Enzyme design. Structure first.
Site, PDB file in Angstrom:
ATOM      1  N   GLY A  11       0.884  -1.021   0.100  1.00 51.35           N
ATOM      2  CA  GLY A  11       0.116   0.012  -0.171  1.00 51.35           C
ATOM      3  C   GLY A  11       0.848   1.223   0.059  1.00 51.35           C
ATOM      4  O   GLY A  11       2.106   1.273  -0.025  1.00 51.35           O
ATOM      5  N   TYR A  15       2.755   9.296   4.504  1.00 51.72           N
ATOM      6  CA  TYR A  15       4.072   9.492   4.386  1.00 51.72           C
ATOM      7  C   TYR A  15       5.080   8.833   3.324  1.00 51.72           C
ATOM      8  O   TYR A  15       6.232   9.240   2.845  1.00 51.72           O
ATOM      9  CB  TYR A  15       4.697   9.383   5.865  1.00 51.72           C
ATOM     10  CG  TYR A  15       3.785  10.278   6.974  1.00 51.72           C
ATOM     11  CD1 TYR A  15       3.512  11.734   6.763  1.00 51.72           C
ATOM     12  CD2 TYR A  15       3.186   9.457   7.575  1.00 51.72           C
ATOM     13  CE1 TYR A  15       3.032  12.380   7.873  1.00 51.72           C
ATOM     14  CE2 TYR A  15       2.399  10.302   8.569  1.00 51.72           C
ATOM     15  CZ  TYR A  15       2.028  11.514   8.694  1.00 51.72           C
ATOM     16  OH  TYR A  15       1.201  12.197   9.508  1.00 51.72           O
ATOM     17  N   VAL A  17       5.634   4.491   1.050  1.00 43.67           N
ATOM     18  CA  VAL A  17       5.092   3.158   0.775  1.00 43.67           C
ATOM     19  C   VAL A  17       5.102   2.325   1.573  1.00 43.67           C
ATOM     20  O   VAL A  17       6.224   2.287   2.470  1.00 43.67           O
ATOM     21  CB  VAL A  17       6.108   2.920  -0.558  1.00 43.67           C
ATOM     22  CG1 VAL A  17       5.393   1.628  -1.308  1.00 43.67           C
ATOM     23  CG2 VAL A  17       6.391   3.814  -1.517  1.00 43.67           C
ATOM     24  N   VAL A  18       4.213   1.251   1.642  1.00 42.06           N
ATOM     25  CA  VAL A  18       4.292   0.195   2.735  1.00 42.06           C
ATOM     26  C   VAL A  18       4.503  -1.107   2.132  1.00 42.06           C
ATOM     27  O   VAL A  18       3.751  -1.488   0.962  1.00 42.06           O
ATOM     28  CB  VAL A  18       3.081   0.091   3.473  1.00 42.06           C
ATOM     29  CG1 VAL A  18       3.118  -0.852   4.503  1.00 42.06           C
ATOM     30  CG2 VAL A  18       2.779   1.457   4.083  1.00 42.06           C
ATOM     31  N   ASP A 118      -5.684  11.070  13.249  1.00 41.30           N
ATOM     32  CA  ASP A 118      -6.018  10.773  11.717  1.00 41.30           C
ATOM     33  C   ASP A 118      -6.495   9.269  11.618  1.00 41.30           C
ATOM     34  O   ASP A 118      -6.091   8.481  10.853  1.00 41.30           O
ATOM     35  CB  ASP A 118      -4.750  11.119  10.704  1.00 41.30           C
ATOM     36  CG  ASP A 118      -5.531  11.147   9.280  1.00 41.30           C
ATOM     37  OD1 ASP A 118      -6.660  11.369   9.035  1.00 41.30           O
ATOM     38  OD2 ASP A 118      -4.457  10.985   8.266  1.00 41.30           O
TER      39      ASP A 118
HETATM   40  C1  A28 Z   1      -4.723  -5.292   3.858  1.00 45.71           C
HETATM   41  C2  A28 Z   1      -3.657  -4.717   4.955  1.00 45.71           C
HETATM   42  C3  A28 Z   1      -2.105  -4.950   4.395  1.00 45.71           C
HETATM   43  C4  A28 Z   1      -1.476  -4.225   5.303  1.00 45.71           C
HETATM   44  O1  A28 Z   1      -0.879  -2.990   4.754  1.00 45.71           O
HETATM   45  N1  A28 Z   1      -1.081  -4.829   6.552  1.00 45.71           N
HETATM   46  C5  A28 Z   1      -0.204  -3.951   7.603  1.00 45.71           C
HETATM   47  N2  A28 Z   1       0.505  -4.628   8.244  1.00 45.71           N
HETATM   48  N3  A28 Z   1       1.004  -3.585   9.414  1.00 45.71           N
HETATM   49  C6  A28 Z   1       0.864  -2.447   8.877  1.00 45.71           C
HETATM   50  C7  A28 Z   1       0.916  -1.334   9.457  1.00 45.71           C
HETATM   51  F1  A28 Z   1       1.997  -1.111  10.583  1.00 45.71           F
HETATM   52  C8  A28 Z   1       0.637  -0.105   8.726  1.00 45.71           C
HETATM   53  F2  A28 Z   1       1.051   1.118   9.231  1.00 45.71           F
HETATM   54  C9  A28 Z   1      -0.302  -0.099   7.818  1.00 45.71           C
HETATM   55  C10 A28 Z   1      -0.637   1.084   7.274  1.00 45.71           C
HETATM   56  C11 A28 Z   1      -2.055   1.185   7.079  1.00 45.71           C
HETATM   57  C12 A28 Z   1      -2.595   2.526   6.359  1.00 45.71           C
HETATM   58  C13 A28 Z   1      -1.641   3.463   6.344  1.00 45.71           C
HETATM   59  C14 A28 Z   1      -0.393   3.543   6.312  1.00 45.71           C
HETATM   60  C15 A28 Z   1       0.085   2.235   6.902  1.00 45.71           C
HETATM   61  C16 A28 Z   1      -0.624  -1.169   7.158  1.00 45.71           C
HETATM   62  C17 A28 Z   1      -0.155  -2.570   7.495  1.00 45.71           C
END
Ligand code: A28
Length: 289
Positions: A11, A15, A17-18, A118
């Site tokens: 995602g 801030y 890329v994840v 947020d």
């Molecule tokens: C379908 C969900 C998959 C996923 O991204 N899991 C995640 N696992 N751990 C995460 C996390 F520590 C995060 F901070 C975010 C995140 C979510 C929204 C905005 C910014 C970051 C997502 C995940």
């Protein structure tokens, strides 16, 4: 980083890329956020605020014009679960369990004077065991909330508290209670409570439903920076029309989470004691991964 083998991009945050990644020395599966002194200080402190309903911050890596945040991994988010459940709705016992768990996470952070600022369905993560966790907690204190994300995407205004929209410089813990109430209403109705597309549209949508605030319901409101006497004067709608067919206990809790005055708005601690929580259980959701 060198110690992580990237599996896939999962995602795009506010801030950076994840990614889904695997640690090479531990074999641990994590969520890896890549961003781009006072901010580093604030974020390093977040390694100590641990709770079962808060996504764990495993490590903070600052190197070669980049900030790496290593997080606990969860398979799904509430936004996608809400979309997948749009036809039949999320069952009331699960909505209740999710709200109860979310309030516990808020009560813990707020007790350590840490606010999120947020909250949205996209940053609420779920697992197959019926657990729900808050992600990105404390990042807004460190960097602030921008108009647009790093990809230029518009940051959602839908869950923003009215005191923020009215120009207050000092936000209290009450801001997170407002956002969570907006989320509670959305799980019940399968539609966004206040889907604003500009700051003024967001404020006027709140006003149309809850009534235009005045010195009676909110002492000091007319003195706030962005308050204008030219604001249209709308009447408060009956709560039975707001979230049908939610019962009176649910409607009573939602009204308290949506109070205009941040001093009158229910705390996460007092919300946990509300009669709505008398029959709470911990059911499991039907996720296919
Ligand atoms: C379908 C969900 C998959 C996923 O991204 N899991 C995640 N696992 N751990 C995460 C996390 F520590 C995060 F901070 C975010 C995140 C979510 C929204 C905005 C910014 C970051 C997502 C995940």
């Amino acid at each position: 980083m060198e110690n992580f083998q990237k599996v896939e991009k999962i995602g795009e945050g506010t801030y950076g890329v994840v990614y889904k990644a695997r640690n090479k020395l531990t074999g641990e599966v994590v969520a890896l956020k890549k961003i781009r002194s006072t901010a580093i200080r604030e974020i390093s402190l977040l390694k100590e605020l641990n709770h079962p309903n808060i996504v764990k911050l495993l490590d903070v890596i600052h190197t070669e014009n980049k900030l790496y945040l290593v997080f606990e991994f969860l398979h799904q988010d509430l936004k996608k679960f809400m979309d997948a459940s749009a036809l039949t709705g999320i069952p009331l016992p699960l909505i209740k369990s999710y709200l109860f768990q979310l309030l516990q996470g808020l009560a813990f952070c707020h007790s350590h004077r840490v606010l999120h600022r947020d909250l949205k369905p996209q940053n609420l993560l779920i697992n197959t065991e019926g657990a729900i966790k808050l992600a990105d907690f404390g990042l807004a204190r460190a960097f602030g909330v921008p108009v647009r994300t790093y990809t230029h995407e518009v940051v959602t205004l839908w869950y923003r508290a009215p005191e923020i929209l009215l120009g207050c410089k000092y936000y209290s813990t009450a801001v997170d209670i407002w956002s969570l109430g907006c989320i509670f209403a959305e799980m019940v109705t399968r539609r966004a409570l206040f889907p604003g597309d500009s700051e003024i549209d967001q404020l006027f949508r709140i006003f149309r439903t809850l009534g235009t605030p005045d010195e009676v319901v909110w002492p000091g409101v007319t003195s706030m920076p962005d308050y204008k006497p030219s604001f249209p004067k709308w009447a408060r709608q009956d709560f039975s029309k707001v979230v049908p067919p939610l019962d009176e206990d649910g409607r009573s809790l939602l009204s308290q989470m949506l109070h205009y005055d941040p001093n009158k708005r229910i705390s996460a601690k007092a919300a946990l004691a509300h009669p709505f929580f008398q029959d709470v259980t911990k059911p499991v959701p039907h996720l296919r991964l």
